[PDB]
Amino acid sequence: GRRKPRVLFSQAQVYELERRFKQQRYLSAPERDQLASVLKLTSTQVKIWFQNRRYKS
Amino acid sequence: GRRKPRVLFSQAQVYELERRFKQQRYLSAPERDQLASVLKLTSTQVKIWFQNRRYKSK
DNA sequence: TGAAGTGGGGGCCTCTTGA
DNA sequence: TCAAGAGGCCCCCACTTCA
Ligand SMILES: [Mg+2]
């Protein structure tokens, strides 16, 4: 049936995620929530981005 | 069918567990493994004892 | 009695998918 | 492409269960 499409993170969102990754490979529960607010993404999305980022690297 | 029995912890083991609990309500994996080794219990039993002790503390 | 089971949070890691 | 699915394994709290 119809399903929700994956939406790519913008250049700005990716830049900030990367900028933060350069300072911390792992984020605590509070930090994820905060960054998710700054990026306008969900806590989970930030959590998974870091997870895939640690894996990719 | 027959299933493994629940074995109680000795007075000495519980005494040491209650001693550590008065020092820390929670333990890290290294702390849980070192205590398990000392008491002759697995790390899961220790983990589960602190979990239960906390619930009962409520 | 009281350690252990059930089940519902989250989490990290690892590999793979497919609009 | 690349965020997300999903198996494998961990810690926590609530609330029982029954040798
Ligand atoms: Mg796409």
User: With left for phi above 0 and alpha for psi between -120 and 50, is residue B24 left, alpha or beta?
Assistant: beta
Distance of CA B29 to the CA centre of its chain: 12
Q: What values do phi and psi take at B25, rounded to 5? A: -80, -20
Give A33 Cα–ligand 1 centroid separation in angstroms. 25
- Distance CA(A17)–CA(A13), nearest Å, equals 6
* Helix, strand, or coil (residue A43): helix
Give B26 Cα–ligand 1 centroid separation in angstroms. 43
Which range of residues forms the domain containing residue B31?
1-58
Residues near chain D (nucleic strand), Cβ < 7 A?
A: A 6-9, 14, 44-45, 48-49, 52; B 5-6, 26-27, 29, 32, 43-44, 47, 50-52, 54-55, 58
Long-range contacts of residues A42-51, Cβ cutoff 8 Å, at least 24 apart: A45/A9, A46/A17, A49/A9, A49/A17, A50/A17, A50/A21, A50/A25, A50/A26
The technique is: X-ray
In the structure, how far is the CA atom of residue B14 from the C1' atom of nucleotide C6, in angstroms?
A: 25
B34: domain CATH number is 1.10.10.60
What would the two tokens of residue A33 be?
């929530």
User: In whole angstroms, how far apart are CA B46 and each of A1, A5, A16, A20, B18?
Assistant: 48, 45, 42, 37, 11
C-beta of residue A17 within 8 angstroms of C-beta of residue A49: yes
Q: What is the resolution of this structure in A?
A: 1.7
Please count the structural domains in chain A. 1
